[PDB]
Design a protein around this nucleic acid. Sequence first.
DNA 1: CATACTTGCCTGGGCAATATT
DNA 2: GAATATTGCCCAGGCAAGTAT
Lengths: 140, 141
Amino acid sequence: SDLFNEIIPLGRLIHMVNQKKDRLLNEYLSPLDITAAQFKVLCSIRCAACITPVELKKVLSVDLGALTRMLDRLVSKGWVERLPNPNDKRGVLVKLTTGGAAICEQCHQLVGQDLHQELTKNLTADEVATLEYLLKKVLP
Amino acid sequence: TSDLFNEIIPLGRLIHMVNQKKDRLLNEYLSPLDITAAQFKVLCSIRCAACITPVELKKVLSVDLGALTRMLDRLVSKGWVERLPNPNDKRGVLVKLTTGGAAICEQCHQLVGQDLHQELTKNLTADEVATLEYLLKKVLP
DNA sequence: CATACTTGCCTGGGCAATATT
DNA sequence: GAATATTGCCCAGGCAAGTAT
């Protein structure tokens, strides 16, 4: 008797889907020497253009110290630069460098929609949309 | 300005945040027993198998073998799991639950019950949940 | 005092060598 | 040769204590 599937039938399922997505995404991003997490953060910064670590934390749903070390790694890889914040002397601003935008465009052009297709190759557009709706309805 | 990430994987942030919520909830439910969600999961698998090799356990958990080795080390140091020489393989190891491991496992089972499945699926109907699972399994390899 | 990092310690997973058999 | 651990080096997140403004 599987105690875990008795308590949370969804649990293993959600976990495994998330894992599949992570593995696939990493495989696709692999030839450009960037990870899925790093790429995700780069995309968020790219959305905001300019953003503070706390708001970035809000967007990614992640711990602030974790994001700090992430930003350290991103800076050392020359994808991200830290700027002073004209509105606050204790905070900083985070923005993409030229290389950041570069590798974002490289990721976009390389991966395209191949990943989205492979991940949902067993589903139809209606099934994908329904899955999306249900999933977001799970969100509090 | 537009989301490149969301453009490439429309379900990415969504599955991630759902899974994260699930994990945070399960961790908060298991708080007083001083056992994490992952640890409890491995304890469950070992419990079902009764006896199991780390390779088979790796396949049933879908986790790296080395990571699993370290997890098993943690579970041993907390006196929940024991390793023993595998009588059917000279190079293998069998893993099993200690009495305390099975005890805290049962403690968890009785503690959380269906509260987690309930709180996670409260915004859904019965067959909304059923459909959700169906689709989720069909996605899986 | 309140906020924004910042760092340290911990669990945890992925990948890459090792023995061991 | 092939499969089974085990270990080391990474990246990565949660948590808490400390720092800066």
